Design a protein around this ligand. Structure first.
Ligand SMILES: NC(=O)C1=CN([C@@H]2O[C@H](COP(=O)(O)OP(=O)(O)OC[C@H]3O[C@@H](n4cnc5c(N)ncnc54)[C@H](OP(=O)(O)O)[C@@H]3O)[C@@H](O)[C@H]2O)C=CC1
Ligand SMILES: N[C@@H](CCC(=O)N[C@@H](CS[C@@H](CC(=O)O)C(=O)O)C(=O)NCC(=O)O)C(=O)O
Length: 315
């Protein structure tokens, strides 16, 4: 399987290139190399401040006729400060302009938490806590559905939503388009078995982010767990004659998830895409699943008091 079918009738490439932390001066090249080596899915976000440069790469590959638009699956996300109904279209249009596209294949609500609109991505009060906005995810969802009806995005989805929050949408009175995807953190240390089973049971595709444990996360404390250096995982990689990163990318692929490893290193980009020629045994799968620790790379600690903070619930 190269792609998964979404509840909107389209197929999403199970492997995509992530761009969080991909510096503006290296991500144009990273995306160009990725398409050249076969990637057909790019994960982006206005909050990553590098969409214009990712856009250059895409436009050049289209222009060079290396790939056609219908063959690409581009994803972006609505940042928290744009949850207000009157701000969603504008945020979507800014991202389409920076990426130089006429439509997005998928547009996601980045976080269930809406913040106060303004220039600051994380507006804080005189103590730090983020200043929420009185918008609710349901109203925000309605504005997202309007983008589909306006031709701006082909599918809409969510990210970092817990199962009760997914249920909130599925239960929205008047619900017109169900979320096609829920992109959540997923790797051997945060396996997400309940939230994934819940989503798949609802026909919602799950995209696993930080599949490698985001070793380049800014808040990395060199004492923290490290997937790429876990000997149990390297032994598994060793057995299949693959790299540990290849094992970590193949792992969610076999649980029927979409996976989006990030790299701005050409050789890594190529290496990461070489995950369709081997299979992990169900025994390897269950062993990897056993390493779960409920360890999160992205906990959004600055919003633990927000009404819609997603991680107080067990899933
Ligand atoms: N919805 C959300 O809230 C979130 C979405 N995401 C999405 O998921 C993507 C991927 O997750 P991310 O957090 O970036 O972290 P990843 O788990 O993808 O790991 C990226 C780090 O791993 C390194 N790496 C990549 N390939 C290899 C390799 N083969 N061997 C050794 N090291 C490697 C990269 O190095 P280098 O680049 O130097 O090669 C980088 O430092 C994000 O970029 C973003 O698109 C991420 C977080 C949150
Ligand atoms: N991207 C943010 C980074 C600062 C931030 O607050 N990041 C959050 C979100 S992580 C990331 C998730 C993603 O990639 O979508 C993001 O949106 O920036 C975070 O890591 N919180 C846990 C903490 O208190 O340290 C920014 O600079 O605007």
């Amino acid at each position: 399987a190269s792609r998964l079918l979404l509840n909107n009738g389209a197929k999403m490439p199970i492997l995509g290139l992530g761009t969080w932390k991909s510096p503006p001066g290296q991500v144009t090249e990273a995306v160009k190399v990725a398409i050249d080596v076969g990637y057909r899915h790019i994960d982006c976000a206005h909050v990553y401040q590098n969409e214009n440069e990712v856009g250059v790469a895409i436009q050049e590959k289209l222009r060079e006729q290396v790939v056609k638009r219908e063959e690409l699956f581009i994803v972006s996300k609505l940042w928290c400060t744009y949850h207000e109904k009157g701000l969603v279209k504008g945020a979507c249009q800014k991202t389409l302009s920076d990426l130089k596209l006429d439509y997005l294949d998928l547009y996601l609500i980045h976080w269930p938490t809406g913040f106060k609109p303004g220039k600051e991505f994380f507006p804080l009060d005189e103590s730090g806590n983020v200043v929420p906005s009185d918008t609710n995810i349901l109203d925000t969802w309605a504005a997202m559905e309007e983008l589909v009806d306006e031709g701006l995005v082909k599918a809409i989805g969510i990210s970092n939503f817990n199962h009760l929050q997914v249920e909130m949408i599925l239960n929205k009175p008047g619900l017109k388009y169900k979320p096609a995807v829920n992109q959540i953190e997923c790797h051997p240390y945060l396996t997400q078995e309940k939230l994934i089973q819940y989503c798949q049971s609802k026909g919602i595709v799950v995209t696993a982010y930080s599949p490698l444990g985001s070793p380049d996360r800014p808040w990395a404390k060199p004492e923290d767990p490290s997937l790429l250096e876990d000997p149990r995982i390297k032994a598994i990689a060793a057995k299949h004659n693959k790299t540990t990163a290849q094992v970590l990318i193949r792992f969610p692929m076999q649980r029927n998830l979409v996976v989006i490893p990030k790299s701005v290193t050409p050789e890594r980009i190529a290496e990461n895409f070489k995950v369709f020629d081997f299979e992990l045994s169900s025994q390897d799968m269950t062993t990897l699943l056993s390493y779960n620790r409920n360890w999160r790379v992205c906990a959004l600690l600055s919003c633990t008091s927000h009404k819609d903070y997603p991680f107080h619930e067990e899933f």
